[PDB]
């Protein structure tokens, strides 16, 4: 009995790897091989956001692109004004061991959990004038790796217990778990089209969900070793994943398979951080060797080096106007480039 | 010239003053990563010691310390123990009665990038019923490599030994100390091995060490 | 809830001195820079003080310069004002007034019950009308001009819009001649080229009756206030 069926999963892997190969007639560097590589990405850090105590985790941009998010170990979730480089608010959490957070699409809210189990809710804009915990989602059993919001009322996490979660933030419960990873899941994005999302986890494998079923479309496996960053691409059919392998890859999602992976014999570090430049040309990747290299994703060129942090770049984003880009690392300041 | 907005820049001033007040009291307290094995006595420190992951503080001869029982975390160790660097020392502790496990644990923890530096208050506990085991089921049974006699300083020796033969870099210290399950001492021995790490840290930012 | 109220009113002879103080409740008052403002019994609004958050820093009208003093107890959430030295002048009831200011904030959102005190180079607000018939269910414009362009270097011009119904307190419409505050219905919209400035109202309701004041916030001045009738 269970013997036939571990064959037939062997069966169905290889089904799905055939026609994978029957489908890959070409790779992306040769079909990209006429393009012009994008040149030097020259780039200068236009602000040093000084104000955190300890290590920096997570940093999250608003979607007005010009307010930003700051989780650090030092207790105090933090928000800023890029432009001006005033802190706005500054929000002590419950407990200072927070690995992720996130601002929601209008800025109502801002989200953040960690090793406590329990993604935070705070709301912003509140009548009083101060930050309000507004509730606290608990039921994952581990850690809280990330998290981001479809809107002011639907969340959706990734746990250190193997599985992501979408909440009912009105009703503080678990509306659809996705479980279906073997390791645990570190890094967590959504489709700009806000259907379906990505998870990458620590068995090397990233793969899709949707948001409404909960059913896994499609499992990515491309990887050496575990996935800490998952970036969906500007246009939805592409994502981008960062592993402690040292190298990111590109994934698409019709062609369900492995498109590119960024690499040089140099670099023996993991990716802790990745994100895309608006037109997506950009593969913007954090390394623990404490910079950030810009991929010419079209071409995997190595296109620049953003260099300037005294320890582990921890996280990264770009603004949604593609202005510029905000590096937070362990050195407990973050920085923002043009 | 700024508007009004020099409003919010003086908020943001009025921010990084308690921004700073905070991080002077928070400075002002001492960490400790509580490690060891199931039912080794990792809450029964704290439980004699006058009290997801849970942090437990009390406070000792003017030091306030928060002990974090990070053992709680089923998760994968190697994704989150970073979050404990820079923390004062690891107050790891195992039960005597048990093994190998801990062992393999302290080998990790001993040689882990992130704890280089960090010195190890290693707490072997159940000293007392150690003994009734001991005289009555041999250390053979648990390392059968032990030849030495089934005397209970030997053998308590030898475990120690074997512990402090998984430290790989010189320059860490592990103040060893028996728990003996009446315990009232282990805030001393705490305290004592928090001294001189406090000692060479100031020592350090002089340039003296 | 949220209030401001405050108490110390009644009469005094001129060249006396009073003091009233406004009790803060319901709000986090360590963290907002109240203000004072006060309205002749017969006329417009004007601005008196404003002590910010920890105090770090307080304005006062020329007019009432060296002669009040306004100061802030947090700890009771409590805002004074030391009268001293009355004039005929200085009769009116003053409003105390809620403000907190980071990017994307609403002054001036919220105000108190106010208190009656009666005695035995700036940029002025002009409005074009004193008062205006209307009928409900209709549309109408509100406007009014300013000396000075609003519009700061940094794109953000500081226009505000109050509407006291009779028999209450201020209540904000719309900060930044742009942006409607959080409970005014959408019936309200405002814009302007920096100089010159509108409030336009649609689908007006019988509710909605009472006088209009816009409000600089460039440089530490009301409208006369344009009155609508039913």
């Known amino acids: 009995e269970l013997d036939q069926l571990r064959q037939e999963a062997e069966q169905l892997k290889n089904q799905i790897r055939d026609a994978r190969k029957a489908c890959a007639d070409a790779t992306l560097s040769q079909i990209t091989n006429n393009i012009d590589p994008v040149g030097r990405i020259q780039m200068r850090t236009r602000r040093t956001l000084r104000g955190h105590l300890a290590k920096i985790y997570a940093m999250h941009w608003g979607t007005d692109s010009r307010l930003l998010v700051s989780a650090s170990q030092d207790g105090k979730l933090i928000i800023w004004d890029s432009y001006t480089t005033n802190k706005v608010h500054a929000i002590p959490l419950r407990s200072s061991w927070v690995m992720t957070c996130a601002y929601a699409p209008s800025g109502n809210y801002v989200a953040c959990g960690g090793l406590d189990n329990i993604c935070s809710i705070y709301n912003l804009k509140t009548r009083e004038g101060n930050v309000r915990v507004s509730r606290e989602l608990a039921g994952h059993t581990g850690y809280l790796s990330c998290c981001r919001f479809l809107d002011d009322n639907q969340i959706v996490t990734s746990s250190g217990d193997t599985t992501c979660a979408l909440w009912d933030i009105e009703t503080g419960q678990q509306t659809t778990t996705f479980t279906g990873h073997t390791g645990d899941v570190m890094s967590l994005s959504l489709a700009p089209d806000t259907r379906l999302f990505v998870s990458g986890a620590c068995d090397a494998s990233a793969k899709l969900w949707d948001v409404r079923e909960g059913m896994c479309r499609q499992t990515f496996t491309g990887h050496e070793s575990d996935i800490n960053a998952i970036c969906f691409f500007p246009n939805g059919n592409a994502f981008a994943t960062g592993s402690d392998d040292a190298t990111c890859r590109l994934f698409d999602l019709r062609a369900d398979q492995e498109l590119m992976t960024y690499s040089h014999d140099n670099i023996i570090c993991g990716i802790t951080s990745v994100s895309f430049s608006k037109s997506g040309r950009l593969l913007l990747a954090g390394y623990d060797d404490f910079n950030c290299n810009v991929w010419d994703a079209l071409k995997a060129d190595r296109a620049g080096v953003l260099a300037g942090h005294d320890n582990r770049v921890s996280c990264l984003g770009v603004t949604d106007d593609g202005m510029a880009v905000a590096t937070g690392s362990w050195d407990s300041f973050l920085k923002i480039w043009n | 010239l700024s508007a009004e907005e020099r409003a919010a820049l003086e908020r943001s001033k009025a921010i990084e003053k308690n921004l700073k007040e905070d991080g002077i009291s928070a400075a002002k307290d001492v960490k400790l990563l509580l490690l060891g094995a199931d039912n080794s006595g990792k809450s029964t420190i704290v439980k004699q010691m006058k009290i997801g992951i849970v942090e437990t503080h009390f406070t000792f001869k003017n030091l306030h310390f928060r002990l974090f029982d990070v053992g709680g975390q089923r998760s994968e160790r190697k994704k989150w123990i970073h979050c404990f660097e820079d923390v004062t020392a690891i107050i790891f502790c195992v039960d005597l009665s048990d093994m190998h496990e801990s062992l393999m644990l302290f080998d990790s923890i001993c040689n882990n990038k992130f704890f280089i530096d960090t010195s190890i208050i290693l707490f072997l506990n159940k000293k007392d019923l150690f003994g009734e085991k001991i005289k009555k089921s041999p250390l053979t049974i648990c390392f059968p490599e032990y030849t030495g006699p089934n005397t209970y300083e030997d053998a308590a020796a030898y475990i120690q030994a074997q512990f402090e033969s998984k430290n790989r870099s010189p320059n860490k210290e592990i103040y060893c100390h028996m728990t003996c399950a009446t315990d009232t001492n282990n805030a001393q021995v705490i305290f004592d091995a928090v001294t001189d790490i406090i000692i060479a840290n100031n020592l350090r930012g002089c340039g003296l060490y | 809830d949220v209030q401001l109220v405050e108490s110390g009113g009644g009469l005094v002879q001129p060249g006396g001195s009073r003091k009233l103080s406004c009790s803060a409740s319901?709000?986090?008052?360590?963290?907002?820079?109240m203000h004072w403002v006060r309205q002749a019994p017969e006329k417009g609004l004007e601005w008196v003080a404003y002590?910010?958050?920890?105090?770090?820093?307080?304005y006062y009208a020329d007019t009432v310069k060296g002669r009040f003093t306004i100061s802030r107890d947090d700890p009771k959430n409590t805002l004074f004002l030391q009268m001293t030295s009355l004039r005929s002048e200085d009769t009116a009831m003053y409003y105390c007034?809620?403000?907190?200011?980071?990017?994307?904030?609403?002054?001036?959102?919220?105000w108190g019950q106010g208190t009656t005190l009666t005695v035995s180079s700036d940029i002025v607000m002009t409005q074009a009308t004193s008062s205006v018939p209307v009928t409900p269910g209709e549309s109408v414009s509100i406007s009014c001009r300013s000396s000075?362009?609003?519009?700061?270097?940094?794109?953000?011009?500081?226009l505000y819009w109050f509407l006291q119904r009779p028999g209450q307190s201020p209540q904000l419409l719309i900060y930044?001649?742009?942006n409607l505050a959080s409970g005014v219905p959408d019936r309200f919209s405002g814009s302007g080229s920096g100089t010159a400035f509108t409030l336009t109202i649609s689908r007006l309701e019988a509710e909605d009756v009472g006088v209009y004041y816009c409000?600089?916030?460039?440089?530490?001045?009301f409208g006369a206030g344009t009155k609508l009738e039913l």
């Open positions: 409000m600089q916030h460039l440089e530490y001045t």
């Open positions: 930044r001649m742009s």
């Open positions: 319901g709000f986090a008052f360590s963290s907002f820079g």
């Open positions: 007034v809620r403000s907190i200011y980071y990017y994307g904030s609403s002054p001036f959102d919220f």
């Open positions: 000075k362009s609003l519009l700061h270097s940094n794109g953000n011009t500081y």
């Open positions: 002590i910010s958050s920890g105090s770090g820093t307080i």
